[PDB]
Amino acid sequence: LPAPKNLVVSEVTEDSLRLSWTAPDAAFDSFLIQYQESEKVGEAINLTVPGSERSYDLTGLKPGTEYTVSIYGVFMKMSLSKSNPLSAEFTTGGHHH
Amino acid sequence: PAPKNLVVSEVTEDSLRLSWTAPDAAFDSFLIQYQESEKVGEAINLTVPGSERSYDLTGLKPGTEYTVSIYGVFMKMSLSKSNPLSAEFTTGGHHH
Ligand code: NA
Structure with a gap:
């Protein structure tokens, strides 16, 4: 079954991660991206992006x-x-012939 | 759910005017199929919109x-x- 592949960062700063991934062309209508600090400090965050996207900041x-x-x-x-x-x-009207 | 109360409202020598009931907006359309009873493998199929309750x-x-x-x-x-x-x-910089 189709799935995103090759999840990397293309850029990192002190307050950002620019994500990059691959996916079959028009396999997906959108992407759901979920992120949270790994230790689980702070909120789990859910975002949606259009299915044509292959990167997100x-x-x-x-x-x-x-x-x-x-x-x-x-x-x-x-x-x-x-x-x-x-x-x-x-039954229709009339005499059968 | 399914359509109910399939009757004819009118009959002539060459036509059958069908009528049926269904719950409001239960269906997006109806498939009607018909054939001479004493016949196999000559069926006729058509669709009508889900707002319709009759067909000639x-x-x-x-x-x-x-x-x-x-x-x-x-x-x-x-x-x-x-x-x-x-x-x-991991983000850049020093953890605080
Ligand atoms: Na579902």
């Missing part, structure tokens, strides 16, 4: 701090379901 | 029994996520 971080980052591909599927049928027999 | 079957043979089936059709939307990809990264 995590900003407003604390210096010298380890973060656990998770990325999920998100996909929508549309299908049609069918009820059980209702059936009846009817 | 025309160009039929006189004095002939027809089997008619109606299905309620609903559009299902699914939202799913892949397996996560996870990594740990």
Whole structure:
């Protein structure tokens, strides 16, 4: 099954991590990115980005701090379901020929 | 849920005007299938919008029994996520 791959940082500063990853073209409608300080100090944060993105800047971080980052591909599927049928027999007017 | 109360409202020598009931907005459309009863493998299929409660079957043979089936059709939307990809990264600078 499809999934994001190759999660790296392309840039780091004292308060940011610029993420980069790969994914099959149009496999995903969006990405869910979850991040939190690794020791679990501070809030777990959830963000969404468009499915065409392959990079994202995590900003407003604390210096010298380890973060656990998770990325999920998100996909929508549309299908049609069918009820059980209702059936009846009817006869047209007139004389059979 | 499913359509209920399939009847004809009108019959002529060449037509059957179908009528049925369904809960408001239960279905996005209806599938109607019909064929001469004493016949196999000549079925006719069509769809109508989910707001409709009648449909005219025309160009039929006189004095002939027809089997008619109606299905309620609903559009299902699914939202799913892949397996996560996870990594740990350290920001720049000195921890405080
Ligand atoms: Na779901």
